Amino acid sequence: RAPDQDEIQRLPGLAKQPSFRQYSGYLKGSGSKHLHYWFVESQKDPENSPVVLWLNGGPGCSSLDGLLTEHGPFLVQPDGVTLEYNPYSWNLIANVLYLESPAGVGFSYSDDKFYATNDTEVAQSNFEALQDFFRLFPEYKNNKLFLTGESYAGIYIPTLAVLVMQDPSMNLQGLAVGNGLSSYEQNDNSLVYFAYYHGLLGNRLWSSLQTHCCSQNKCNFYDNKDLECVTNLQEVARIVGNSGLNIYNLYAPCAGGVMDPPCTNTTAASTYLNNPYVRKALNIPEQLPQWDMCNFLVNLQYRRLYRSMNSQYLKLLSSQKYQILLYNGDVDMACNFMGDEWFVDSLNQKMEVQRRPWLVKYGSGEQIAGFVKEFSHIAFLTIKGAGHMVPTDKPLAAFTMFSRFLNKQPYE
Amino acid sequence: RAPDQDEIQRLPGLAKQPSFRQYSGYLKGSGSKHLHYWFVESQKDPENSPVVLWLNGGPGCSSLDGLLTEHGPFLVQPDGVTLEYNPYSWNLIANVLYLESPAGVGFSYSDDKFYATNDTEVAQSNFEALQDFFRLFPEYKNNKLFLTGESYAGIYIPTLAVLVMQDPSMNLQGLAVGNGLSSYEQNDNSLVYFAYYHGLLGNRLWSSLQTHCCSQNKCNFYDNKDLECVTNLQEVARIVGNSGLNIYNLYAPCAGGVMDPPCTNTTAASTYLNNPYVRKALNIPEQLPQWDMCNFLVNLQYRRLYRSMNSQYLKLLSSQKYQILLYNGDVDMACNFMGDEWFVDSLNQKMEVQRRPWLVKYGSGEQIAGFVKEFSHIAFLTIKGAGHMVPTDKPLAAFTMFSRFLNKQPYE
Ligand SMILES: *[C@](O)(c1noc(-c2ccccc2)n1)[C@H](CC)NC(=O)[C@H](CC(C)C)NC(=O)N1CCOCC1
Ligand SMILES: *[C@](O)(c1noc(-c2ccccc2)n1)[C@H](CC)NC(=O)[C@H](CC(C)C)NC(=O)N1CCOCC1
Ligand SMILES: *[C@@H]1O[C@H](CO)[C@@H](O)[C@H](O)[C@H]1NC(C)=O
Ligand SMILES: *[C@@H]1O[C@H](CO)[C@@H](O)[C@H](O)[C@H]1NC(C)=O
Ligand SMILES: *[C@@H]1O[C@H](CO)[C@@H](O)[C@H](O)[C@H]1NC(C)=O
Ligand SMILES: *[C@@H]1O[C@H](CO)[C@@H](O)[C@H](O)[C@H]1NC(C)=O
Numbered sequence: 001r002a003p004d005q006d007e008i009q010r011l012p013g014l015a016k017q018p019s020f021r022q023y024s025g026y027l028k029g030s031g032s033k034h035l036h037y038w039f040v041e042s043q044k045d046p047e048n049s050p051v052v053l054w055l056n057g058g059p060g061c062s063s064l065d066g067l068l069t070e071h072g073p074f075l076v077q078p079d080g081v082t083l084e085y086n087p088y089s090w091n092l093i094a095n096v097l098y099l100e101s102p103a104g105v106g107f108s109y110s111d112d113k114f115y116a117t118n119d120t121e122v123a124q125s126n127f128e129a130l131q132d133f134f135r136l137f138p139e140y141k142n143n144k145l146f147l148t149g150e151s152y153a154g155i156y157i158p159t160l161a162v163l164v165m166q167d168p169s170m171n172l173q174g175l176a177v178g179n180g181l182s183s184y185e186q187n188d189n190s191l192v193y194f195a196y197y198h199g200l201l202g203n204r205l206w207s208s209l210q211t212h213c214c215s216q217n218k219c220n221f222y223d224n225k226d227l228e229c230v231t232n233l234q235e236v237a238r239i240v241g242n243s244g245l246n247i248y249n250l251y252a253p254c255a256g257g258v259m260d261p262p263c264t265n266t267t268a269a270s271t272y273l274n275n276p277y278v279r280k281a282l283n284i285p286e287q288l289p290q291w292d293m294c295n296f297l298v299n300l301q302y303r304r305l306y307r308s309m310n311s312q313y314l315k316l317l318s319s320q321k322y323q324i325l326l327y328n329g330d331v332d333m334a335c336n337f338m339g340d341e342w343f344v345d346s347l348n349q350k351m352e353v354q355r356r357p358w359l360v361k362y363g364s365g366e367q368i369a370g371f372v373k374e375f376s377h378i379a380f381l382t383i384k385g386a387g388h389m390v391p392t393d394k395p396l397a398a399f400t401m402f403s404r405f406l407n408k409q410p411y412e
Numbered sequence: 413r414a415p416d417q418d419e420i421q422r423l424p425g426l427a428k429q430p431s432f433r434q435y436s437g438y439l440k441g442s443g444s445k446h447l448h449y450w451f452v453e454s455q456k457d458p459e460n461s462p463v464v465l466w467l468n469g470g471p472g473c474s475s476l477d478g479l480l481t482e483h484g485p486f487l488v489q490p491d492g493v494t495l496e497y498n499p500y501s502w503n504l505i506a507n508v509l510y511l512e513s514p515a516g517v518g519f520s521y522s523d524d525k526f527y528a529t530n531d532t533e534v535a536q537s538n539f540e541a542l543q544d545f546f547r548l549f550p551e552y553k554n555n556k557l558f559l560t561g562e563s564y565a566g567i568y569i570p571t572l573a574v575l576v577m578q579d580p581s582m583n584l585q586g587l588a589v590g591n592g593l594s595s596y597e598q599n600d601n602s603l604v605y606f607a608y609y610h611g612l613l614g615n616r617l618w619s620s621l622q623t624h625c626c627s628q629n630k631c632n633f634y635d636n637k638d639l640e641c642v643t644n645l646q647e648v649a650r651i652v653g654n655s656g657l658n659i660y661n662l663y664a665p666c667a668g669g670v671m672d673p674p675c676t677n678t679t680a681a682s683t684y685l686n687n688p689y690v691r692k693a694l695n696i697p698e699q700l701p702q703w704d705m706c707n708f709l710v711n712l713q714y715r716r717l718y719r720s721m722n723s724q725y726l727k728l729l730s731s732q733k734y735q736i737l738l739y740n741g742d743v744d745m746a747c748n749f750m751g752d753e754w755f756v757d758s759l760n761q762k763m764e765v766q767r768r769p770w771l772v773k774y775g776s777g778e779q780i781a782g783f784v785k786e787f788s789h790i791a792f793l794t795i796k797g798a799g800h801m802v803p804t805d806k807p808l809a810a811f812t813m814f815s816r817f818l819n820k821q822p823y824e
Binding site for chain 1: 776
């Protein structure tokens with residue numbers, strides 16, 4: 001019924017043993033690829049709880065970021081030694097499959113160590129690994145399956161979903177993308193607005209942008225050839241990303257001051273997972289190189305193929321079989337909320353609902369946790385005051401949203 | 413040399429006695445008005461430290477909000493009983509005069525209890541009270557004087573400054589306004605942008621606003637007569653201010669859930685100052701009614717006269733004798749940063765400097781604390797991630813800014 005050689009017996013750093021079973025080993029991707037997974041079964045009724053795949057983005061970043069720092073059952077502490085139980089873990093109500101992907105990311109590897117890849121190969125390799133998961137965990141084949149991820153997984157998840165939807169053996173029910181890259185064009189255009197209206201660009205630069213980049217009511221901050229325009233957008237990019245502002249959360253400090261995503265400090269997770277006894281407990285082959293949160297070389301060699309997920313989401317929507325959610329922390333600048341809201345609105349789906357706040361109960365009382373824009377089979381949500389890593393910044397709100405999604409309830 | 417009957421001997425709730433002298437009593441305003449002051453001398457060298465007037469806004473709100481909750485030498489704790497020393501107090505480097513104004517606000521009163529007033533009378537009464545302060549504290553007449561305040565004090569301070577500048581006996585050196593109301597028009601126009609680009613309004617409403625309120629490149633969200641326009645702006649106002657979003661800090665909870673400014677809880681300060689022994693220590697006449705942070709009736713009866721401080725600041729700038737600062741926490745929606753930046757840019761002053769980040773040292777290191785836009789004798793600054801009450805939300809950054817201002821140093 002399970003790869004019991006993969007079972008995690010006693011995880012270092014945990015003061016209490018888990019009530020749920022958990023597994024760490026390798027799923028077969030395409031060719032010679034072996035993708036490191038860490039599967040944490042539901043804390044409540046895993047036999048009948050959904051199976052939820054989690055993919056972090058990059059490209060080249062590890063989904064074990066999602067486990068140990070966002071919504072895993074325990075989170076690594078600043079000592080890089082202690083794990084503490086997370087009261088907002090997504091595995092409270094789901095069997096969560098964190099997958100280090102593509103090959104070369106974290107503990108994932110391949111026999112030839114050739115890690116140059118692309119969107120289509122990545123989707124196909126993720127698909128084969130999910131096939132392997134269900135060969136390894138056959139008692140999970142009939143559980144409702146949701147595909148979820150973050151950041152560049154805005155591309156990984158919908159492309160993977162299109163493959164999965166053609167496999168009647170997988171009980172695909174839904175996909176959720178957090179601060180996802182869905183449209184380079186909508187991302188880039190929305191980002192320049194976001195920057196000005198969050199007080200990062202002044203009047204002089206804005207007016208320069210307006211002159212060289214825009215024609216009457218429409219701005220092009222994406223593929224404009226205009227000369228001063230390219231120049232100005234270079235300045236925007238510098239301000240937003242290369243000046244000491246944290247691009248992942250405008251209102252958070254830049255770690256380090258004004259494999260090392262900018263303004264971020266991955267030392268806790270890194271120190272934890274490179275502990276030799278941690279790797280033993282996670283059944284990592286000793287010969288594998290050190291764990292990094294993001295593989296520089298995977299990212300360097302990656303050929304990005306899709307500029308928009310418009311056609312993927314229209315395909316997923318046409319079946320009317322799946323619930324889809326795009327959610328953005330609204331102080332993120334890497335994949336800002338507005339570009340994904342524009343993106344969802346532009347799918348032009350039926351049953352449009354008026355935009356509303358959605359609430360969470362804090363003690364403190366009901367608070368607005370964000371806004372929800374709903375259509376048939378698809379909702380866009382903001383998470384108010386969260387950056388790129390929504391479940392780290394607003395764990396209760398993230399858990400509440402996640403539960404409403406799995407249960408196909410209204411978000412409000 | 414001082415009204416020693418006003419001296420505060422032993423303030424309830426303080427575990428240690430202050431190193432500085434402090435005073436609480438009444439300054440004579442115009443007619444029968446008596447304005448309650450609380451003056452806290454500098455913790456370092458009060459004889460040669462600047463005199464800084466602080467005014468909160470409303471109209472009808474108490475400057476003792478500024479003392480006990482923003483930048484006073486001690487801050488009231490959630491028990492409404494304990495005061496704790498504030499390591500970022502503005503009185504570390506200044507003699508700070510907190511003035512409850514106009515008559516009827518907090519412990520301020522008048523013999524006829526007639527509290528209907530207006531901008532011009534308020535400025536003239538504040539002016540006479542400052543004259544009285546210097547009659548009561550004559551050893552302070554030659555200290556550099558700065559006039560500072562917050563919110564509606566965006567109107568109080570510049571109007572007062574114009575009066576003070578005509579009095580050669582006062583050594584006026586500068587004025588600073590935090591999240592100030594400077595221009596109803598620039599406030600309202602900037603606010604509708606701010607709302608859309610912070611994800612509070614969706615596409616449908618934005619497009620409706622664009623259609624009914626705007627003509628080609630210019631929007632009028634201020635005095636538009638257009639019909640759907642008024643309707644839509646009513647919806648914006650509802651979303652921003654009457655729906656459970658905290659207008660003073662978009663990213664903060666609304667106290668109470670989705671004399672009581674909305675989403676705010678003044679119980680700590682209120683419980684402290686209504687303690688009968690607190691009032692005795694502050695030399696408050698026992699017959700005075702209870703302390704409220706904002707006087708409902710003062711605000712109700714207030715006749716607001718100025719729609720813009722353009723002409724006041726141009727007068728203050730013409731002398732070239734004063735340094736001026738407008739600073740806004742950038743997640744405030746009551747007086748959003750963008751309207752005040754537009755306002756300062758529109759004064760069209762010389763020696764314009766390119767817009768820059770300004771830094772603060774946290775331990776954590778240097779962090780961007782906001783952006784600074786500088787001209788001759790006037791700077792606009794943002795405080796990144798602060799709401800309406802900048803010194804509560806970012807006390808170190810507020811103190812750092814305040815020190816650079818008093819010392820006429822660059823903000824960066
Ligand atoms: C997203 O895919 C992502 N994946 O991992 C992260 C991450 C952020 C903070 C901490 C840990 C992980 N984010 C985004 C989508 C834009 N990808 C990234 O932000 C890239 C992360 C690299 C692989 C280290 N970075 C970039 O795309 N850029 C482009 C602009 O120049 C700076 C970095
Ligand atoms: C500003 O003058 C101000 N003065 O005191 C405050 C304050 C905010 C939070 C907590 C404690 C004090 N702010 C602003 C300038 C717009 N004034 C206010 O926000 C008014 C406060 C009243 C007097 C209680 N409120 C309003 O102007 N409105 C107008 C729109 O409808 C709602 C309240
Ligand atoms: C990074 O994180 C580690 C572990 O939490 C911490 O000890 C270290 O000081 C952090 N900061 C920097 C700037 O390295
Ligand atoms: C993506 O990768 C596959 C597998 O290597 C390769 O055959 C294919 O040509 C690639 N696609 C592109 C456009 O490079
Ligand atoms: C208001 O503040 C007081 C004092 O800090 C606190 O005890 C009370 O619970 C607060 N909240 C509400 C909703 O009254
Ligand atoms: C403001 O108040 C003064 C004092 O009462 C009064 O004489 C004056 O007419 C007022 N101004 C206006 C425009 O109401």
